[PDB]
Symmetry: D2
Subunit: 456 residues, 4 copies
């Protein structure tokens, strides 16, 4: 089916409501025209993020009642540990409270000041932890990944020429590691092919260069491989995930995305010495290696959720629900990033707001406007998120200036997607009413989370 | 709007197996083609009943953690008591484990042997308790109610002329009470008008006759009054509910329907002497006047659920979701009972399977086909459920030969309704192919529950 | 150990508090000097009953999240069914919402008007359902069971001479069945020996007479066998329970006691025809045979709880905790029923209130006084509970006029038992201050639940 | 009262296996005689830590079902915020996943390289974050605090003369802040007086120096002030807490201790500029200012828990339960650190095992013996945890050679405390029999966590 029904039933519900346009306009101004600054009670359908907003299952909630809260030797840690060993195939696991805790560890463990880390397009917290540990980020994604309207498969793929070039020009000894994200978030949740993961492993291994995956949406990625990469049509999601990680030296994961939980993450690796060092560090920032700043019940929920994520019908429906929203928007002529990604539809703010320059912060502005007009919260994914260049002080200027309608897993229905698609279409009808924004408060890093603006 | 989006979001899901057609055919065969014999774990969408199958909210689940399990004097009882007093406007309430417990008490309290109870059609358990206690049942519903093809509003209304006639012929002192069900189950879930409730109150009061409501689906009823009865457009669901019960001396309620719970019910009355007698009887069958065969946590969940049921958008969506399924089937020419009721759609299997005689069990066979083709369980409400006359050996032969698609509250989406409808519509397109069934195992009693069949 | 520590940890807690003596005195009068009529919020340590007041485990609560709420074919029903078949060894099970639902079924199924039912001392709801179905109750417990101060083991044992006499005098065809309760509640929670269950089975079987157990505290009973009956010291609690039921034709159970749950019960039998008839009847009163007026989650909790009850250390501690309270009271000279039973300490009201006649309702009075002085709720187990004789109209006059400090399972600690033992001792210090009571309101049956009194 | 009964009852239990001594010896052996390597499932009473091991209430569990999981603007954040503002009287709050997350932020915000931080002794993570950020730590605790045998009140007090000296010698501008821990962990859980907190506030304020509290066990601290400091007898715990923090510029809190939760913490401050800087940093390590690496449900549980912790009877019992264990051990002559603190009893293993040298690891071996004899897990806080100097290869040799019996809140009873005490007392009676240990596996770092031993 193009649009399969939900492969589950509703066990329990939460109420939703809208507040009038008048009240919302007030709300937008008080939050400094930053969607991140509005309040949950004041949002009707909350598409700010798929991070930590997922609906758990009855089985996960049963697990939540069996939290073994012991400081060491918790049954829940053992369960998480064996589940991740089985499904991802890495030797060692260190839990963290969420993904950026695992990134903090990896960046501290694996980077010497002055080294390069190369990856398939930047990410916000990722680039910050790289640069903060003294690395220079090098983007080795294909150029097309940066082309919002260009409909090509596996846009997350690393350009092997660009990786080769980097090795020739910098020397392998000066490359800390390759960071391969699956899927790639800021390109629109775009997948990476198995062929590419293999080619990357083969080339890096020849030069002694390590490869670490950002596993945050690895199940979404595995769906796209099953659906689109020749030869995978009859492999299970689980077989695909396990092969994917077989091409990496470890990974970082925000369990708050594809593990179907509201909190949780981990770091995995194969190297014994790196494991020892990681355990020394986790103690500083997260907790003991035996819980990593998580309750036992959350290690349990994450163990159960990661295994539920492997069910074909679940991930099929997850991705196709997002695709439905994208398809409706596209059929009506609304400009979006193509092809639609695994976790969100990204309105292309540049086409949505032609009359604005990117220095007017179109994406940031549009997010505000969608809120005012519809009560739907969405996230800036453009020049604000891109941050400032640490060499020059200027904004980084990403070609992708996008606005994210991000779908939490197992929370909404197609009828909710229809409510969203209608609101957006209507706002499009007068997109020339969307006004320029400028900063009134800029944080020194990760500025998008809490920055505030005023209309120009 | 014809079909509103869900006025809630999903908090947690209930996992399902998603077994394919070929495995569903084997399950159906192991169940002897009787959907009552299917395992819950093998069913995608379970439309067997809207009784006790509802999804609770996060607020209810919070209440579930706050059970005061005291044998007497529980805080949860006091919460339930004050909620029902507020919402229904009865003086006194006695909790019961579900509806038939309340019906048991009412019939023992209110009936002298040889007296008549008259009502708007009947229900099996309700009428059972009436007759076991010495009453003669008299149907006083409008003749129109019995025409399953007649599309008319407020089809559950009592014919005042039949009630007058009853009083004139039998005498007021020989009428135990009038039993008014809101909505009326056996007509397909048909509402009763406020005008009718007042007319019945006025007539009965003039002769000193009591009126007790079967309040099981009273909120669905209130929604039909708000939608369709002139003058109720500025009235809340809560205002409509409170006015309805103001025309009664008390009620029985299966909370498992419109109170949005999985278990629970109660008996209400205004008469102090009846209340006293009820509390003397509740202890024989159910429990204390302050728990009545319910855990404290369930009194809490029912108190919270009944108040949630008052939200306009909730009950609008509830009824319009069922209407969606009915509308879709009718548009494709599928024969159904009309008009569609608040909680279920009934397929007319007599017309669906015109090539089959009632002796070949078309409703039973059609419910089998539906499961095999879609993973949807439905209930036979036809010749099999009618049972066999054990004196003569002849089938009881009901005019209604139906398959009931009963919709639990807040469990399913419109996409699930599409799975149901598309599958039935596809079956209808080659209806002549549906095979008759014959008994291979038949119990002497309760045959619908455990009978097994094979194809002719 | 005499007093083992709790063989579990506290997973979660509930607050407790006391209200001043002044407030309580007011409270006692408003509740008509009937403890059953006070409110949970107004009680500090609630020893009214061990029925439905037990603390569940983490595992049971995990089960509570996996309620399969289907009308038929619930995984929870299957689990309960197989657990009871395995542990009790009966062929068939019909769930009920609690014990008196199962008694209603058994009494209707197994009694012809005018027949006798003989048992080991009466019980309140049991005797009512017998008499209400037309049976005459005959007490065949040993005389010593009625002697409160007499410390003998296995006081619940049936007097085989008395059973033989009954058969000689009435004829076996006129005995509906023998009702054997394990333990026996009103004798002080007194156990029955395996030897006695065997002797009873052998004698009844020879005459074709059926035996049905009241299984409500069967695990407590099995503990006493393990502890005290020669030859059982090395059998497991589970092996003992399974042998016990091997001597019966079925049973009734209030799961609210030894199954460690807050609601739930069942009826078991071996007879296929009785099973069919039971399923016909359960539909009238409780629900479908597939849930019997219980949520799926409660069938699940009861299945899990019955198996947890089999853990030796759990039941050892359960019984010895009660014994601790009894021992402290006895060491101080407070008069109690001896030996202490499995679930409560029964203050002997006759010795506690020598200056009152039993027509002054000493037990009922004392319960009120303990409340006023201590904030501890306890239950009347004497002449009020005994009810009226249905032949003569006079009070039944039990030799045992007792007041029950009933201990919910897994709820309190020894420190709580110490608080209780101190309060009681102090009140003893002036027991001549306890005043006569008389009726001001008497219900027509089971009068103790809601009767009200005034001081004479 | 010396030892109050539990001011709560048990809502639910956590199941335990109850394995006998012989099976415990095998588990201990499989764990290489290191209690840190024991499986939680094999432990009866787990006194490894009071961090994150507490039992929640029914009210907290209700809050757990009400998680608003929004990425920003969660209702649970607003609830936590207003509770902490009300109870602690700080202007601003930033949630963190636990204490060390808050400490990370504070030290980065408040320390310039080369500056001193002075405090009442130190804690490992706290001091780590101080030093990693460029600070020199100076101990300003009273000399008395370091005498582990000295039984004196308010042993956690800062010596004002040491603080004066520090200011005089180094200059106010070179002091980053004073870090005052309430209670003081390393002295055995020793309280700080309100007099001392005011004196420290007055001195620091006069030189413009900031004061930040480690609020981790501030409620235990407040209880000692109420019990022992003149003039605080008419003051509630809440009033004492609010006054304490009125003498600070902010605090860090591991909610996992006195907030009665399994995960959670926060950073508080009064300074608007610091608040702004903190929110810029929280996003790098933890999450949004409105979740800080916590699920919505955990912010809710912590908000509810902190308010429960204010109940006098709760914290009285908490501290007196630990005191009970200490009192019982001392009465039998068992050597312990004095006076007993709010959350743990420390056994002096140097004196307990006088026949052993520190090189034979008496604390480690004693913790092993305790587990084998009782099923109680305790923590080695001695030479093993001190680690090895990797430069010289020599053990770090601490003056304190202790076994920590750390008491989780609301988990255990006095009977459990008796299991602990009776077992230790029995071991003490034949203390000469306790065998020394030697390394068979030693990691280079974090040795206490995974080292394995065998008997000498
Ligand atoms: K149910
Ligand atoms: K209960
Ligand atoms: K924990
Ligand atoms: K969350």
């Amino acid at each position: 089916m193009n649009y399969p029904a939900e492969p589950f039933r509703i066990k329990s519900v939460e109420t939703v409501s809208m507040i009038p346009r008048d009240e919302r306009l007030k709300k937008m101004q008080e939050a400094g025209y930053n969607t991140f600054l509005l309040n949950s009670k004041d949002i009707y359908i909350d598409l700010l993020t798929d991070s930590g907003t997922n609906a758990m299952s009855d089985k996960q909630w049963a697990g939540m009642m069996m939290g073994d809260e012991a400081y060491a030797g918790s049954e829940n840690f053992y369960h998480l540990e064996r589940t991740v060993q089985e499904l991802f195939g890495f030797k060692h696991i260190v839990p963290t409270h969420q993904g950026r805790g695992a990134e903090n560890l990896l960046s501290q463990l694996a980077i010497k000041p002055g080294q390069y880390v190369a990856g398939n397009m930047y990410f916000t917290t990722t680039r910050y932890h790289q640069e903060k540990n003294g690395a220079v980020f090098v983007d080795i994604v294909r150029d097309e990944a940066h082309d919002a309207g260009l409909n090509i498969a596996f846009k997350g793929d690393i350009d092997l020429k660009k990786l080769q070039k980097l090795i020739d020009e910098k020397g392998a000894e000066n490359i800390a590691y390759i960071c391969l994200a699956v899927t790639v978030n800021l390109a629109g949740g775009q997948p990476v092919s198995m062929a590419n993961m293999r080619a990357v492993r083969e080339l890096t291994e020849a030069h002694g260069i390590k490869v670490f995956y950002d596993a945050t949406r690895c199940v979404e990625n595995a769906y796209f491989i099953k659906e689109q990469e020749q030869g995978f049509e009859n492999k299970s999601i689980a077989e695909i995930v396990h092969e994917m990680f077989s091409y990496a030296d470890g990974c970082t994961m925000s369990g708050k995305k594809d593990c179907l939980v509201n909190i949780g993450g981990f770091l995995c690796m194969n190297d014994d010495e790196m494991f020892s060092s990681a355990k020394e560090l986790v103690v500083v920032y997260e907790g003991m290696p035996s819980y990593g700043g998580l309750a036992g019940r959350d290690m349990e929920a994450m163990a159960i959720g990661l295994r539920e994520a492997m069910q074909y019908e679940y991930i099929e429906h997850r991705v196709k629900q997002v695709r439905y929203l994208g398809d409706k928007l596209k059929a009506a002529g609304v400009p979006i990033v193509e092809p639609v990604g695994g976790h969100a539809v990204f309105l292309d703010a540049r086409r949505f707001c032609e009359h604005l320059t990117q220095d007017e912060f179109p994406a940031q502005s549009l997010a505000a406007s969608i809120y005012v007009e519809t009560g739907v919260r969405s996230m800036e994914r453009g020049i604000i998120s891109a941050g400032r260049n640490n060499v020059t002080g200027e904004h980084h200027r990403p070609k992708l200036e996008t606005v994210r309608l991000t779908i939490p897993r197992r929370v909404y229905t197609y009828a909710h997607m229809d409510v969203v698609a209608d609101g957006i279409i209507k706002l499009y009808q007068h997109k020339e009413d969307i006004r320029g924004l400028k900063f009134i408060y800029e944080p020194k890093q990760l500025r998008f989370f809490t920055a505030r603006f005023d209309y120009i």
